């Protein structure tokens, strides 16, 4: 089997990317597990917005890293090179892992 881990800061982008992945999988190979959504990372930051002195004035930002996992259990010869040829949008990190 092969696991594909997608991650991105854009929810709609990651969702459409994993949709394209599962589509090409069901097209070329068969028996793709599914796009299971994993817990998202929320990396927070607090920043003093004043230049010199304001210890109570603070902006509070956070990066939301959404994560998705899909699994293919019946990998054919064409599926691998197909998903390798597939170049996806910018802002999505994809990791392949056999096993």
């Amino acid at each position: 089997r092969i696991r594909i881990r997608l991650k991105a800061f854009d929810h709609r982008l990651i969702d459409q990317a994993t949709a394209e992945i599962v589509e090409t999988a069901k097209r070329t190979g068969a028996q793709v597990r599914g796009p299971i959504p994993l817990p998202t990372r929320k990396e927070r930051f607090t920043v003093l917005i004043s230049p010199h002195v304001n210890k109570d004035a603070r902006d509070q930002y956070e990066i939301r890293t959404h994560l998705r996992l899909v699994d293919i259990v019946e990998p054919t010869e064409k599926t691998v090179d197909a998903l390798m040829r597939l170049d996806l949008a910018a802002g999505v990190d994809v990791q392949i892992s056999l096993g």
């Binding site: 800061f9 854009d10 927070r44 920043v47 003093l48 230049p51 902006d59 509070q60 930002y61």
Partner: protein, 100 residues
């Protein structure tokens, strides 16, 4: 900050990357519990001889845009002010004003 301080930090990091290996193995042979007393003595002496700026503990994290030493954020390499301005301008991907 000052161009002098920025160039100083650059020299610090350069010498650190240069003498990393030798300093690392010297620290290793020193901390080695199964090493000879005289060998460890000579190793400490050579470490002393080595430049001080070659120590990674000597370099200070500075904003890559202004050189500000305070308010540094490792995740971005910029001071808090530059981080906020870039976020507001839309340069830091994924970063947005939070609430909960």
């Amino acid at each position: 900050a000052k161009q002098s301080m920025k160039a100083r930090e650059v020299k610090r990091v350069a010498l650190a990357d240069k003498y990393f290996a030798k300093r690392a193995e010297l620290k290793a042979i020193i901390s080695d519990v199964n090493a000879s007393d005289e060998d460890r003595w000579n190793a400490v002496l050579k470490l002393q001889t080595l430049p001080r700026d070659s120590s990674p503990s000597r370099q200070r994290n500075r904003c890559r845009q202004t050189g500000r030493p305070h308010g540094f954020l490792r995740k971005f390499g910029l001071s808090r002010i530059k981080v906020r301005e870039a976020a507001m301008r839309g340069e830091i991907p994924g970063l947005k004003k939070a609430s909960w």
